Design a protein around this ligand. Structure first.
Ligand SMILES: [Zn+2]
Lengths: 326, 345, 326
């Protein structure tokens, strides 16, 4: 029935069905994406709040309809929600082990994990999962949006906190540095060793100033091509402090001088042109700092528009001629 | 009849200069810090009564329509008019960008609020139409301040009736397409402004348009309405690509072509959530601050008979940004309108 | 040591050292800038709250790392904090005399005061202090960003309230009107007498509309040249209501349709190209109206980026060969 497309006559992403975190159940359910909540923040060295993001994000998504008229796409059924990875507190070794297993398990199903943190360090283990999934004879690419490089070889004596995340990810043996993009870095939360390691490893990050200097889209397109050309799987990650402060207040560490929502919506379409992605993460939403749920809404529209734009690319559209009077 | 005190306060330190309201206050601080008994723009109160309006010679009536129980989303817009009125205390009625004294140019009056009958959308909308009728029959153009987006139903009804054998255009600027044939059977909720306008005898599809839409709070029938009736939609995407001035000017030409009157409803959720968090259903990917003022300026160059502004909910904004954006939407419309009239002689 | 440049192992500006308001002590401390809090609000004609701005501004600045990778500059040591000017309540003439003496004293040291209000009338007194400091044989320039002209010859019969600030500053005898700039004026908090008095004196203000019609930067450059070319000292002030409401909600009198964060950051660099400034002020931050510290954080980033850009123009950069774990 198509009643849900039209004006009328459980806490899950997009009001989607729950399916257990089980490869066989996921393979049989008919969906293309699987939402996984990861309320973990032991990687966070800044202000708390990310642990409530998965709940807030689900709830915001429940307010949109499944139909996206700009794309002539319905998302109903495209996703399901696996709930949350359950973690013991002050137990970081074992938390990461469980996250790793969960992402391997979704990947085994063939569905695309949508991983909602929680803090940015969860990317390390989700990325390592995709690395292991595809294995040493395939090539991965990686794209991340954020204001911070997170290129700390170590931080405060540790090696897997959020500021080390790219230093660990760029070490994955089937991620060639030339297939790695990092967009939006700016302002001062970027210590000199983050730059020095980048230059040492050849990480061709696109600073926010590089982006503005290039009119944004030309340089984004180049970095999309590096990540998607000649790669077998691509990991896409968001920290919405890539956005200007006014546009995404409810994040762990907001930064002035970022992207506008209209520029991110064009960037989502540019990504969608390549016709697929293997994993999607969003981390560092921080709903206690949010006004009218601005950051959560921005994130929800970005994720849903990427789903819808990918569907439109795949020609997976609704019949134009359907009318409420059927 | 048409009398106001410059900088509000009477008593021993009253000001009486005919133009004191366009200059820095002289004996005191006026209402820039403390609101007192402020009307919209500090204008005279005038009951919404064709006799009183006529006798004052008022050419612009500000009327609030706080009704917020005609809608499907959440209540709150009932509180917006008070925040708007309060916000006008942070401005003069003189706009240097247009060299116009809005208050004397238009002889603006504040007609207070349209009364409501709680729980009764039918009768509340009848009150609204009757009240708007008085302002029109009094010889004024109107600024209507919502209240939920049910407003253009009685609003356009009134202007349609007043327009008679003439023809009326309708423009709708909204994140949301608002073109439900009905919503769970109800023909006159905030979701059906555009279909209810097309139903008017002197409002024709060729003189209707929508601008500003985006995102997924837009069921397919709302889009199908525009396709099937051949009504132009300019999405937010098209406005960004082609440019605001280019699109706005095309649309105003469209809705005014061979019409006698134009109704323009403007939802505050057309504005990007970064500039307007205080809204019943706020949305990213919208108009930026400077673009709101530019659209207002363009609308003032073309002119409309009724401008309505809806869905502002000050409870969900902790700052003054929402209230002061709504002031500017009105003040730039009026400023540009006066500059245009004056250049036309 | 340079440990602060790198990933790790009193409320003051930038967590800087406290140094007394003392010409001799300031000259000796090594810093180039001295932060001066001025929590005076009795020139305010509008909504209350600016008294709290010096505290809130300082707190945001304590969150930043000192190293800016976009400039390759370290701000550690570049500033000290002189605390707040001691001022009586309900005695504005005496308050303004205290501010005067505080500003002359910092200027006597050769350091650049960074003066944080508080209300806009504090600029009258700081600007007069700079005028008198340089003396009758020197030429001053003055550049201010704000949505209000503040050109009331009088207000409520008074001559030194916030809306009078530019009317007083443009009377300083060694400030030629040709060396004055005012950028961003817009909307209706600009009564006819402010326009008339501007015209009478030949104040060549750049309205927001003029700036947009010009694409901003071509006109800002022309006004920077008028203030810096051929003057001996330059006063730069900010009311962050010059910014769009979206990126500055927490100000005394917020204004829609203004500069966005990236545009002000480009303006900062254009100013820095001129290789110096004599005084920096910011007034009318108003934290009770702020949305998640947005305005305060934009202000902080503007001020710190101006310091960094200026250091970069001067070649005061860090040795690139320096590495962590040294
Ligand atoms: Zn709407």
């Amino acid at each position: 029935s198509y009643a849900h497309l039209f004006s009328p006559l459980l806490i899950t992403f997009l009001r989607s069905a729950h399916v257990p975190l089980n490869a066989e159940a996921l393979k049989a359910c008919g969906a293309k994406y699987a939402f996984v909540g990861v309320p973990f923040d032991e990687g966070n060295i800044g202000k708390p709040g990310s642990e409530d993001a998965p709940r807030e994000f689900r709830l915001i998504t429940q307010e949109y309809f499944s139909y996206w008229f700009e794309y002539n796409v319905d998302l109903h059924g495209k996703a399901v929600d696996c709930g949350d990875v359950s973690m013991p507190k002050v137990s970081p070794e074992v938390a990461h082990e469980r996250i790793y297993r969960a992402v391997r398990e979704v990947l085994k199903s063939g569905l695309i994990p949508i991983i909602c943190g929680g803090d940015r360090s969860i990317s390390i283990t989700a990325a390592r999962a995709l690395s292991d999934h595809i294995g040493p004879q395939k090539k991965m690419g990686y794209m991340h949006f954020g204001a911070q490089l997170d290129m700390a070889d170590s931080w405060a004596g540790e090696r897997n906190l959020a500021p080390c995340a790219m230093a660990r990810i760029t070490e994955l043996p089937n991620l060639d540095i030339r297939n790695v993009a990092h967009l939006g870095a700016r302002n001062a939360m970027n210590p000199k060793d983050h730059i020095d390691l980048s230059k040492e490893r050849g990480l061709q990050y696109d600073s926010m100033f590089d982006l503005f200097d290039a009119g944004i889209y030309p340089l984004v397109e180049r970095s999309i091509d590096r990540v998607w050309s000649g790669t077998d799987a691509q990991y896409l990650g968001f920290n919405f402090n890539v956005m200007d402060s006014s546009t995404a207040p409810g994040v762990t560490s907001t930064e002035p001088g970022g992207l506008e929502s209209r520029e991110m919506m064009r960037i989502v379409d540019m990504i969608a042109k390549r016709g697929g992605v293997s994993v999607i993460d969003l981390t560092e939403l921080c709903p206690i700092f949010d006004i009218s749920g601005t950051a959560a809404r921005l994130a929800a529209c970005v994720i849903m528009r990427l789903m819808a734009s990918l569907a439109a690319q795949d020609g997976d559209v609704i019949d134009d001629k359907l009318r409420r009077t059927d | 009849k048409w009398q106001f005190t410059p900088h509000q306060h009477r008593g021993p330190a009253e000001q009486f200069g005919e133009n004191d309201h366009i200059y820095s206050p002289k004996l005191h601080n006026g209402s820039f810090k403390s609101r007192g008994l402020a009307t919209f723009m500090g204008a005279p109160y005038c009951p919404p009564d064709r006799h009183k309006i006529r006798e004052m010679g008022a050419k612009i009536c500000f009327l609030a329509v706080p009704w917020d129980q005609g809608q499907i989303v959440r209540a709150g817009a009932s509180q917006g008019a008070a925040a708007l009125r309060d916000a006008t205390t942070q401005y003069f009625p003189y706009m240097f960008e247009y060299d116009v004294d809005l208050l004397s140019f238009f002889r603006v009056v504040d007609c207070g609020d349209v009364p409501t009958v709680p729980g009764n959308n039918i009768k509340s909308q009848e009150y609204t139409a009757d009240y708007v009728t008085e302002c029109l029959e009094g010889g004024a153009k109107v600024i209507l301040f919502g209240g939920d987006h049910s407003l253009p139903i009685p609003g356009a009804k009134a202007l349609s009736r007043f327009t008679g054998s003439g023809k009326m255009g309708y423009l709708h600027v909204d994140c949301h397409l608002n073109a439900a044939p009905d919503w769970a059977g109800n023909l006159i909720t905030n979701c059906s402004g555009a279909p209810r306008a097309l139903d008017l005898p002197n409002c024709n599809a060729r003189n209707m348009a929508h601008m500003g839409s985006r995102n997924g709070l837009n069921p397919k029938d709302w889009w199908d309405f525009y396709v099937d009736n051949e009504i132009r939609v300019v999405t937010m995407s098209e406005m960004i690509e082609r440019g605001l001035e280019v699109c706005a000017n095309e649309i105003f030409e469209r809705v005014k072509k061979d019409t006698d009157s134009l109704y323009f409803t403007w939802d505050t959720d057309s504005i990007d959530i970064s500039c307007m968090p205080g809204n019943s259903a706020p949305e990213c990917y919208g108009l930026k601050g400077r673009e709101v003022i530019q659209l207002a300026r363009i609308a003032g160059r073309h002119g409309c008979d009724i401008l309505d502004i809806v869905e502002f909910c000050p409870y969900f904004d902790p700052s003054q940004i929402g209230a002061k954006m709504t002031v500017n939407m009105i003040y730039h419309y009026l400023g540009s309108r006066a500059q245009t009239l004056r250049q036309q002689g």
